[PDB]
Every structure is written in C-alpha cells, then in structure tokens.
Amino acid sequence: SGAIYVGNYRVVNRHLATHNDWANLVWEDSSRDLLVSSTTAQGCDTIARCDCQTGVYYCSSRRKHYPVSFSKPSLIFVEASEYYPARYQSHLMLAVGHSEPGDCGGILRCQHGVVGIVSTGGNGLVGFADVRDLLWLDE
Ligand SMILES: COc1ncccc1NC(=O)N1CCC[C@H](C(N)=O)C1
Ligand SMILES: [Zn+2]
C-alpha cells in the first residue's frame, strides 16, 4: 500500500484504488497501473522533474529503504495477475531489489522529489511506475 499526496491530488496504484478514489477520479491509466483522485486537504509531497536513474525506495515487506539504480521509463511485459491480464505496462522502470505484492505503493525518491511508486516485481526485481512526466500534478 501507499500513495503520493501532491496539491489536491492523491496518486495510487490503479489496482489498489478504493471506492473513494473512483468516486473522486481525476485520471486513470490501466496500461501504467496509475490512478489519481482529488482530495480536500493539501498534500505533503513534491514531484521530481529530472532524469535521475538512481534513488531510494521504501520496501514495506522489510520495513526498510533501499538504494536502487533503475532503467528509464519503458514498455515492459508483465505476467498475468488477479488484477490484470498478461500485458505490456508502459512508463515502467526496473531495478534489482526486493519486493512482494503488498509492497505496491512504496515511494521511490531521488534528491529532487518523488519519482514514482512500486508497481511490479519478482525474483529480485522491482518495478516502479514513473510519475515525472505528469506535469499537471503540480498545477
Ligand atoms: C511488487 O509486486 C510484486 N512483487 C513481487 C512478486 C509479485 C509482485 N506482483 C506484481 O508484480 N503484480 C501484482 C499486482 C499488479 C502488478 C501490475 N502492475 O501489473 C503485478
Ligand atoms: Zn532527480
């Protein structure tokens, strides 16, 4: 679990969005595993606008943060799960690191701000849904 709170927006993994997220929907994209909902309170986070390929992510299944080197956002094949058929997920960044399904939502940050959230993993890989191209989150 986990979310990014920026301005009057909440960014979550689309497959973990709640009834309240869908009732206050701003934007969603199944190919990116992202959903953004509107909030009444002002959010605590800021979004990185950079080309960093290193950062630190929060891993809830270890109660720890780990440093990572990750690929540029790309179109990556993701195996079928209970949430989606087998498909290509876009804007995904992979790194070597630990994850379990419940780690989805953990934030990846660089020195500039939030880069994305944990969205996929397995066998010592972890994948992050990038949010740095979503410029409207800041307006
Ligand atoms: C962090 O996730 C994991 N980590 C380790 C083992 C397995 C997983 N799970 C996944 O990768 N899933 C399940 C949830 C929906 C994901 C998607 N973005 O399509 C795919
Ligand atoms: Zn950065």
Curated annotation (Swiss-Prot):
Any coiled-coil ranges, and where?
none
Annotated catalysed reactions: Selective cleavage of Tyr-|-Gly bond in the picornavirus polyprotein
The entry's Zn(2+) 1-binding residues are: 50, 52, 110, 112
Q: Where is the active site?
A: 15 (for protease 2a activity), 33 (for protease 2a activity), 104 (for protease 2a activity)
* Disulfide partners: none
What top-level branch of life does the organism fall under?
Answer: Viruses
**Protein purpose:** Cysteine protease that cleaves viral polyprotein and specific host proteins. It is responsible for the autocatalytic cleavage between the P1 and P2 regions, which is the first cleavage occurring in the polyprotein. Also cleaves the host translation initiation factor EIF4G1, in order to shut down the capped cellular mRNA translation. Inhibits the host nucleus-cytoplasm protein and RNA trafficking by cleaving host members of the nuclear pores. Counteracts stress granule formation probably by antagonizing its assembly or promoting its dissassembly.
Q: How does it assemble?
A: Homodimer.
**Protein name according to UniProt:** Protease 2A
The organism named in the record is: Coxsackievirus A16 (strain G-10)
